[PDB]
Design an enzyme around this catalytic site. Structure first.
Site, short mmCIF file in Angstrom:
data_model
loop_
_atom_site.label_atom_id
_atom_site.label_comp_id
_atom_site.label_asym_id
_atom_site.label_seq_id
_atom_site.Cartn_x
_atom_site.Cartn_y
_atom_site.Cartn_z
N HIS A 292 0.84 -1.19 0.00
CA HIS A 292 0.00 0.00 0.00
C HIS A 292 0.88 1.25 0.00
O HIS A 292 2.07 1.18 0.29
CB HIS A 292 -0.94 -0.03 1.22
CG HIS A 292 -2.28 -0.60 0.79
ND1 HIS A 292 -2.89 -1.70 1.41
CD2 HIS A 292 -3.10 -0.25 -0.25
CE1 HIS A 292 -4.02 -1.95 0.72
NE2 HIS A 292 -4.19 -1.10 -0.29
N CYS B 53 -2.47 0.53 7.09
CA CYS B 53 -3.19 -0.65 7.57
C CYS B 53 -2.44 -1.35 8.70
O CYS B 53 -1.25 -1.17 8.89
CB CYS B 53 -3.42 -1.64 6.42
SG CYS B 53 -3.16 -0.83 4.83
N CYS C 28 0.50 -3.41 6.67
CA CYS C 28 1.24 -2.47 5.83
C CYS C 28 1.87 -1.38 6.67
O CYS C 28 2.89 -0.81 6.31
CB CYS C 28 0.30 -1.77 4.84
SG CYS C 28 -0.33 -2.90 3.58
N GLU D 115 1.97 3.29 1.75
CA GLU D 115 3.01 3.26 2.78
C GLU D 115 4.28 2.58 2.25
O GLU D 115 5.33 3.22 2.12
CB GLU D 115 2.49 2.52 4.03
CG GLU D 115 1.07 1.97 3.78
CD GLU D 115 0.07 3.13 3.72
OE1 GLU D 115 0.36 4.16 4.30
OE2 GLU D 115 -0.97 2.96 3.11
ZN LIG Z 1 -2.54 -2.40 3.27
#
Ligand SMILES: [Zn+2]
Length: 194
Positions: free
Chosen positions: A67, A98, A101, A69
């Site tokens: 993601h 998340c 993540c 990130e």
């Molecule tokens: Zn994620």
């Protein structure tokens, strides 16, 4: 003879920017802006808003659902600077990180604060809670998260949009939305007791 590159003429006519939230049901989507530092100072590449959806196969060595990130987390080693230098990254995604993540990222961070993430997100909706682990981890570990509210909203445009004064406007909903993300970001960190 194309008109202007200011995305809006096609997305507006085609539909109504219905563009659902990230990880909808077809393909990811998010914007990310990073800058490279040269020694005790900062440098600004020649790029405004840019990102890439979906990942490609690395033939015997594919990564997981990275993601935003992890996305930059992956770019920094892309320029392959030096050590005396630095990286001031800035992620723009109406969506926050998340549980996991966030961890992956936080590590890279907590392990080496040498990185500085400035995430500007709009709103997130999940039914977890205990998974928030990473959330408060990459947030405190070194990732600076920000709840993009009305002000930060019209601003979010004013950041990458070719109009520091775009025509976007706020709706009488940002309230509920903001509350959600904020009350959370707050909470996850402020470990809001029972
Ligand atoms: Zn994620």
């Amino acid at each position: 003879h194309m008109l202007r590159h200011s995305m809006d003429p096609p997305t507006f006519t085609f539909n109504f920017n219905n563009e659902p939230w990230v990880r909808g049901r077809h393909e990811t989507y998010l914007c990310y802006e990073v800058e490279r530092m040269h020694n005790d100072t900062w440098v600004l590449l020649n790029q405004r808003r840019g990102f890439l959806c979906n990942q490609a196969p690395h033939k015997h060595g594919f990564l997981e659902g990275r993601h935003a990130e992890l996305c930059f987390l992956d770019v920094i080693p892309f320029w392959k600077l030096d050590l005396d230098q630095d990286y001031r990254v800035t992620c723009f995604t109406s969506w926050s990180p998340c549980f996991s993540c966030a961890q992956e990222m936080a590590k890279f961070i907590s392990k080496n604060k040498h990185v500085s993430l400035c995430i500007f997100t709009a709103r997130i909706y999940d039914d977890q809670g205990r998974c928030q682990e990473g959330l408060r981890t990459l947030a405190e570990a070194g990732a600076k998260i920000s709840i993009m509210t009305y002000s930060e909203f019209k601003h979010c445009w004013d950041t990458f949009v070719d109009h520091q004064g775009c025509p976007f406007q706020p709706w009488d909903g940002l309230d509920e939305h903001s509350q959600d993300l904020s009350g959370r970001l707050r909470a996850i960190l402020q470990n809001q007791e029972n």
